[PDB]
Design a binder for this molecule. Structure first.
Ligand SMILES: *[C@@H]1O[C@H](CO)[C@@H](O[C@@H]2O[C@H](CO)[C@@H](O)[C@H](O)[C@H]2NC(C)=O)[C@H](O)[C@H]1NC(C)=O
Ligand SMILES: *[C@@H]1O[C@H](CO)[C@@H](O[C@@H]2O[C@H](CO)[C@@H](O)[C@H](O)[C@H]2NC(C)=O)[C@H](O)[C@H]1NC(C)=O
Ligand SMILES: *[C@@H]1O[C@H](CO)[C@@H](O[C@@H]2O[C@H](CO)[C@@H](O)[C@H](O)[C@H]2NC(C)=O)[C@H](O)[C@H]1NC(C)=O
Ligand SMILES: *[C@@H]1O[C@H](CO)[C@@H](O[C@@H]2O[C@H](CO)[C@@H](O)[C@H](O)[C@H]2NC(C)=O)[C@H](O)[C@H]1NC(C)=O
Ligand SMILES: *[C@@H]1O[C@H](CO)[C@@H](O)[C@H](O)[C@H]1NC(C)=O
Ligand SMILES: *[C@@H]1O[C@H](CO)[C@@H](O)[C@H](O)[C@H]1NC(C)=O
Ligand SMILES: *[C@@H]1O[C@H](CO)[C@@H](O)[C@H](O)[C@H]1NC(C)=O
Ligand SMILES: *[C@@H]1O[C@H](CO)[C@@H](O)[C@H](O)[C@H]1NC(C)=O
Ligand SMILES: *[C@@H]1O[C@H](CO)[C@@H](O)[C@H](O)[C@H]1NC(C)=O
Ligand SMILES: *[C@@H]1O[C@H](CO)[C@@H](O)[C@H](O)[C@H]1NC(C)=O
Ligand SMILES: *[C@@H]1O[C@H](CO)[C@@H](O)[C@H](O)[C@H]1NC(C)=O
Lengths: 194, 686
């Protein structure tokens, strides 16, 4: 009886501010959760697409955010790009699946203005910059700075007290909304399918 | 942590924060104009440059309040040195304004220079069309009127402008506590250090002098093999023991010898590796060329490109109607923004250019965590050297075979390797004596070791003895032959091309040892070696925050410039050249022969006596060809060339034909014509 409504009735967050659903003591239907969208990727890791819904788990976690599909390659945690460096590092300590989807024009998910993500996050001094890297399954230390948003490319917000800075990039919200889901389960008869 | 240092630290932390924003705006405006050339875009660029210049000048005046002797931190001290440079503000308002007018006149004269044919006045040529002649023609007379034409029109205008340039630049350099403007340029290599890491400005002249004498035995054997080949193309125009005529070297200045390859190829039957047809048979676009370069850098352990690299670069020539000038460049806009501007065709030359440009991007991404002012190469030669090293490895048949661009059964024969190494030396070894002599000349002009009454006298003495090149016609002090080159008329330092070559082969040899290569260096490929790319990356991260001798030791394990790595790379060719020249070819040159020396007449008193003497000779020729040859030839005082002038009145001269400067009138006929008019001319003739 796991609920996915809070995932569908509000505007989705950006990649650096991902939302998290942890389901305990409920029964799920992953087929019903996805048939609503247009899955265009399902790369998994120490699990498989057919075994993802089959199993019974100690706990289940879902992270989700708005994400352009043309940045699909950078969402792998083993990348040296900005998405894994500053926005979202996926934890390979547990079986995880990565789902990229498209929101059909029938689904009434509110859209955001644009896609946003960080290209830099560092502490500054007269001796140079020190990059601040996001930890697996955690949040960037530049979240407080990034919360305000970015309206242009290469726009910087500085925190003059702690001496931190963050730089963002944007992409136009063209056509239907696109999102990304990262599902990680743990091992145990609490969480089961029907 | 003195109050001064504490105060200077707060000052440098506010400047770095504000310079990141303004630099990005200025560079974004400059990119929008260069990829889309319009008048509207040309004003947005100038508005942003004005904002940067206002900010930087105000910050340089604030920086002058922190004395350097009170700063114990080297990172703080290096940033303040950059900001405290005064430049041309040490001159008065009139003198500063005059120096900017001279610099604009000299670059305008160069770029609008136009020469044309003494035998066909209606067809005249600019530099683009004159360089096509010098790079293709095998006609002696055509190459000579193009060579002498460029010097005679362009070079004779810049001589008065260059004499004022030298005086003004020495006043500026002395106002910044240098001996002269050459001492000022040599400060690009000066560093301070504690344990042998210091390097003075006088050390650079000594090191450059010592390396040149080590590469000269190899340059002499290449000079001897090229001279004997040029003697078949131009029979009776070249002495087997003397210098090479300056107008026959394959370009306008003799900087590179690469266009002499068709004349000197060791084995013409065997062709050279070219994979352009393999890229077209597999339908490569320009995107796939840059996707292969990214795979190369990732194979040695270097990062990938940012997402914005692919969306923001200009990798092909646009077809939307935008006007651009195609010249490959890598751009570091700041704020994690890297772009390449390139017009890419599916050829092998563009495949190698892509690897070179992506090497510059990899260096910039490495020192992006340095303070803004230290974000540079260690010296002016490290940046280009890094790009060249990467291109050496990817041009190897071993690398191309692994890419599928060469047949799986491809075998390499030693005659194709000699063809490959000769073509490399026509570029790399041919230009080293050229670069050294020009810097040696400029440095002596700024010192005053050469007075301005002997500028062209010393220029051709040095050409004959350092380069082994002789002028086809004698040039007096109304010429300025150095200034006919782009870098001299545009006020660019030139010794970076010497150092880059030396560092590139030092870097290459270190990395092939780490990659565990067996065999000759020229066959080495560092691809798939993460231990070699990690050793390169520790030097690249430093930027300009350390002495360049310390960054050199990081990768090569030595603190000094060294030419033995260059001589190891060209060792298979040096062995083959000694068998070729060993009756073979004389090795070395004599500074006595010239294309005009055997027809001169020695005459054993100011400049108005010359103009009268040349007209007396010109009249005597014109009458002799009418009363004996029954010809009307309009000889002028411009057809009489005075050379080899001594303080005591003793000079030589010869006559050329009024339309054909290649045709020197024989010494026998000139003597007879003087005897006929000996009465009117009057003077011992030897
Ligand atoms: C090439 O440059 C022209 C000239 O600036 C650009 O045209 C202008 O575009 C801006 C949009 O930022 C408009 O506000 C102006 O009215 C346009 N002016 C003209 C004369 O066209 C053009 O957009 C640029 N092209 C590209 C592909 O960037
Ligand atoms: C950056 O370049 C990519 C090319 O990889 C663009 O991706 C295309 O986006 C459109 C619309 O979203 C799709 O129809 C194409 O299929 C995408 N191409 C590929 C190869 O996937 C992307 O739109 C560009 N981004 C910007 C802001 O210009
Ligand atoms: C670097 O190593 C990779 C493998 O780690 C090489 O890739 C293989 O190359 C062979 C031929 O050399 C091909 O038959 C394989 O299909 C390639 N495999 C993959 C996964 O690409 C690569 O060739 C090496 N590069 C160089 C320059 O030697
Ligand atoms: C390529 O290698 C062959 C060896 O097979 C060389 O041929 C020898 O050349 C030397 C020249 O000193 C002769 O003394 C030998 O008699 C040759 N041997 C044979 C079997 O031909 C050839 O010279 C090499 N080519 C180059 C350009 O170095
Ligand atoms: C899971 O949801 C799908 C979606 O409609 C549905 O067809 C299926 O019957 C559900 N599974 C079970 C066991 O009810
Ligand atoms: C993260 O997103 C949620 C909405 O999903 C929003 O309420 C919250 O303020 C965001 N936090 C930020 C922007 O720091
Ligand atoms: C440092 O700055 C403060 C504030 O402007 C000033 O009072 C102080 O004298 C400065 N110290 C030095 C040594 O410049
Ligand atoms: C210079 O400052 C840096 C950064 O605080 C420090 O690591 C280094 O020890 C300092 N060096 C000296 C000589 O004070
Ligand atoms: C720059 O010029 C000013 C003005 O006289 C002078 O005080 C200062 O010492 C100069 N800077 C250097 C580094 O010599
Ligand atoms: C470094 O300084 C020492 C002593 O001042 C000097 O002997 C040495 O020649 C210098 N090194 C260079 C490369 O100039
Ligand atoms: C050399 O020969 C090739 C092939 O004939 C030709 O394309 C090229 O233009 C020649 N180069 C020169 C400088 O003559």
């Amino acid at each position: 009886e796991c609920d996915f409504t809070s995932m569908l009735t509000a505007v989705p967050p950006q990649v650096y501010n991902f939302s998290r659903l942890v389901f305990t003591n409920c029964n799920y239907n992953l087929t019903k959760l996805l048939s609503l969208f247009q899955v265009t990727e399902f790369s998994c890791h120490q699990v498989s697409p057919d075994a993802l819904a089959s199993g019974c788990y100690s706990s289940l976690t879902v992270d989700y955010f708005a994400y352009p599909s043309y940045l699909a390659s950078y969402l792998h945690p083993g990348s040296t790009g900005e998405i894994a460096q500053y926005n979202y590092k996926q934890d390979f300590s547990n079986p995880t699946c990565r789902i990229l989807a498209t929101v059909p024009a029938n689904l009434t998910i509110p859209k955001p203005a644009r896609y946003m993500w960080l290209t830099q996050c560092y502490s500054y001094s007269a001796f140079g910059n020190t990059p601040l890297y996001v930890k697996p399954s955690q949040y960037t230390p530049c979240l407080s700075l990034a919360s305000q948003g970015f309206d242009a490319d290469s726009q910087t917000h500085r925190d003059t007290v702690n001496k931190m800075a963050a730089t963002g990039r944007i992409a136009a919200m063209s056509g239907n909304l696109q999102m990304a889901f990262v599902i990680s389960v743990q091992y145990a008869n609490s969480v089961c399918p029907m | 942590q003195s109050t001064t240092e504490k105060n200077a630290t707060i000052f440098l932390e506010n400047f770095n924060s504000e310079a990141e924003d303004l630099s990005h705006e200025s560079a974004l405006a400059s990119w929008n104009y260069n990829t889309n050339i319009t008048d509207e875009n040309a004003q947005k660029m100038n508005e942003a440059d004005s904002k940067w210049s206002a900010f930087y000048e105000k910050q340089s005046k604030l920086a002058q309040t922190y004395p350097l002797q009170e700063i114990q931190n080297l990172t703080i001290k290096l940033q303040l040195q950059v900001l405290q440079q005064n430049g041309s503000s040490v001159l008065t308002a009139d003198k500063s304004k005059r120096l900017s007018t001279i610099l604009t006149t000299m670059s305008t004269i160069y770029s609008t220079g136009k020469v044309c044919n003494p035998n066909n006045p209606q067809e005249c040529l600019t530099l683009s069309g004159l360089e096509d002649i010098m790079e293709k023609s095998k006609d002696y007379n055509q190459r000579l009127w193009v060579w002498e034409g460029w010097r005679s029109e362009v070079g004779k205008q810049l001589r008065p402008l260059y004499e004022e340039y030298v005086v003004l630049k020495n006043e500026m350099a002395r106002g910044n506590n240098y001996e002269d403007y050459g001492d000022y340029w040599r400060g690009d290599y000066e560093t301070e250090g504690e344990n042998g890491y210091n390097y003075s400005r006088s050390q650079l002249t000594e090191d450059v002098d010592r390396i040149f004498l080590e590469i000269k035995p190899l340059y002499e054997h290449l000079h001897a093999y090229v001279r004997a080949k040029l003697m078949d193309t131009y029979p009776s125009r070249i002495s087997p023991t003397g210098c090479l005529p300056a107008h026959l070297l394959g370009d306008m200045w003799g900087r590179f010898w690469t266009n002499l390859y068709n004349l000197t190829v060791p084995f013409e039957q065997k062709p050279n590796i070219d994979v352009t047809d393999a890229m077209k048979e597999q339908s490569w676009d320009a995107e796939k060329i840059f996707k292969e370069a990214e795979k190369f850098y990732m194979s040695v352990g270097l990062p990938s490109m940012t997402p914005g690299f692919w969306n923001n670069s200009m990798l092909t020539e646009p077809g939307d109607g935008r006007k651009v000038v195609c010249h490959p460049t890598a751009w570091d806009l700041g704020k994690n923004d890297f772009r390449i501007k390139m017009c890419t065709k599916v050829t092998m030359d563009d495949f190698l250019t892509a690897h070179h440009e992506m090497g510059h991007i990899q260096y910039d991404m490495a020192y992006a965590t340095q303070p803004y002012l230290l974000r540079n190469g260690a010296n002016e030669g490290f940046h280009e050297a890094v790009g060249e090293v990467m291109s050496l490895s990817v041009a190897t048949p071993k690398h191309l075979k692994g890419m599928g661009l060469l047949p799986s059964d491809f075998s390499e024969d030693n005659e194709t390797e000699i063809n490959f190494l000769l073509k490399q030396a026509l570029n790399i070894v041919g230009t080293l004596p050229f670069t050294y002599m020009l810097e040696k000349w400029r440095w002596m002009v700024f010192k005053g070791e050469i007075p301005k009454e002997q500028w062209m006298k010393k220029w051709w003495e040095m050409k004959r003895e350092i380069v082994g090149v002789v002028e086809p016609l004698p040039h007096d002090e109304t010429y300025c032959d150095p200034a006919s080159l782009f870098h001299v008329a545009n006020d660019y330092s030139f010794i970076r091309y010497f150092t880059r070559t030396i560092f590139e082969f030092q870097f290459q040899e270190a990395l092939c040892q780490i990659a565990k290569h067996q065999g000759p260096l020229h066959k080495c490929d560092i691809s798939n070696s993460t231990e070699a790319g990690n050793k390169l990356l520790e030097m690249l991260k430093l930027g300009k925050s350390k002495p360049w001798t310390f960054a050199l030791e990081k990768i090569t394990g030595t603190k000094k410039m060294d030419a033995k790595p260059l001589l190891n790379y060209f060792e298979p060719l040096f062995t083959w050249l000694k068998e070729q020249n060993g009756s073979g070819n004389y090795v070395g040159w004599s500074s006595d022969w010239s294309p005009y020396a055997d027809q001169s007449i020695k005459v054993r008193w100011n400049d108005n006596e010359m103009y009268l003497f040349r007209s007396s000779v010109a009249y005597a020729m014109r009458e002799y060809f009418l009363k004996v040859k029954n010809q009307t030839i309009p000889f002028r005082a411009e057809d009489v060339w005075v050379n080899d002038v001594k303080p005591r009145v003793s000079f030589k001269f010869f006559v050329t034909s009024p339309t054909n400067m290649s045709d020197i009138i024989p010494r026998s006929e000139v003597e007879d014509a003087i005897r006929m008019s000996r009465s009117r001319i009057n003077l011992e003739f030897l």
